[PDB]
Amino acid sequence: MFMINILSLIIPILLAVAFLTLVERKVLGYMQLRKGPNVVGPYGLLQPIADALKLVTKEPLRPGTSSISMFIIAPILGLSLALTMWVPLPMPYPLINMNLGVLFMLAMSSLAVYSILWSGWASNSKYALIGALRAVAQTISYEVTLAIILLSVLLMNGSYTLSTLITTQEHIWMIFTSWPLAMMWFISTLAETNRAPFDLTEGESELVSGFNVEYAAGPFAMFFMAEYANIIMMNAFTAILFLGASHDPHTPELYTINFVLKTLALTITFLWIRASYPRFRYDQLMHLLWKSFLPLTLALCMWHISLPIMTASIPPQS
Template identity: 35%
Template sequence: MMMTINMMAIILIVFISIAFFTLMERKIISYSQNRKGPNKASMTGIMQPMADAIKLMNKEVNLNYKSNFFMFMLSPTVNIFCSGLMWFIYPSAFCFKFMKMSVLYIISCMSVNIIAVMAMSWSSNSNFSLLGMMRTISQLVSYEINLMMIILLSINMSEQMNLEHMKNLTQMSPMALMMTLIFMLWMITSLAETNRTPFDFSEGESELISGFNIEFSGKSFMFVFLAEYSSILIMAMLTSTMFFSMTPMSHMFTPLYLTLCFTFVWTRTSLPRFRYDKLMAANWQQVLPVSMTALLVSFSLKLYYTKNYNQN
């Protein structure tokens, strides 16, 4: 019973964090464009996320008469459910601890999210939704390979599949010297995996209107929206753990975490969108070869130092 209450508390905290993260994003974007942004709901617009949530929950859910009703209603729930499950791997004041195979758990949840996107597109029975799904799936699968390469690099350097031990890999030498380059590749991959600017091709308003979620409205759209922003916060959490040796229980975690979240917003305000063909070419011709080379170098260095250590 206590475990269920703890899980519900974590999910509630995550949803509240997502709500106020959207407010932070709208404020940063508005001030970067020399305008006010949300400032009417309550004091300085602090209740704007709650007003948006109430509006979405009370809007009518429009159904395409050719859609698959059961899958159409279920797929957004699966999407937000998979995003919510990934929050249970982090230690917190609610008695949760790191899972022993937490890295495999994260990879599995990310893979199921792709299936949820496919289900949302297929059940909508819309041409625009189909085109958005094809672009989204190809983008996510391509950059997920690079994501796995970087995670394999981290596993090789830490010799662990547990984030509690992997968080110490930045203290390792001399392999830690390559972490600056790997961190840059990780941030690029994170932006592509979360469909953030300049890689937001799943929701290209100019050509796809809203991509794979074009037919969703009301509560269904809110679930898709929450899952997308939950993935941003999860990637920021993973980054702080893997590259900065910080966990939610660390003293300096909050400033670092807010800085990483600000980075996702800052890229949206500063960088223009890529062309889709350039996005895919950047992964297969530049990002992925560099990450594979770094992985091979890390294996070679690990083998070399392990061999010398055994000889001594």
């Protein structure tokens, strides 16, 4: 039965990724006075299937200068991390219930930077390596703000347990208590998934596709699935962290509906950023992180350590 739980978690997530491709294309199209996929199936509903089928029957050109061991290990690591990021998530009850769930997510997402450091190195070409190094530096630099923002927010939670976030946000959203940290967290999440003006590793008009140039068909498809799973997962984490839904122990379907709707709204906002802004330069986003986000994050961590102590509002640790 637990195996069935794992399967009924993984497979719907991959399906949601597949149709997130369609949803993103349609949202971009309608923001651009066009339609997007509306021919292949009703309202493009069979388009993700067409993409998945075409990709797995397309020739996966592997580079002659590629260390194939890591060339295939990188997609495995990426997709395995992208899937395992959902196992502690408290759609009302988690698959895996840990004391340190958000710490587990921080660690697992920090292991995901290897899939770029290994793909760029394995692909050789002597230039995709530079794009991979830029991506890794961006990822590790925004890990700092992710970690510190999570630390400051959880000082109202009292623990690293994600189920406790539901209890913490019973009467009020955590957004009303930490909105500046919410904006910085949301932009950090944007930057970590290489999205929006932070998509420097796959700049369509900067370096064509960067670290993913040599990957084609199948491994490219799995990398794409990993990225979109990470996008939906990060938006789910954001919804649980800042927009906690009311929970009825006798009707958890209500919480699930609430959470899914809020996660979809945040994902649609992620696609909304993509259609509205130009692209940051690499040094420009590094400057943003290091000289704008980091000082405010340090100050707000200070503030959120001081605040529960000076108001006798320290949460329980149980």
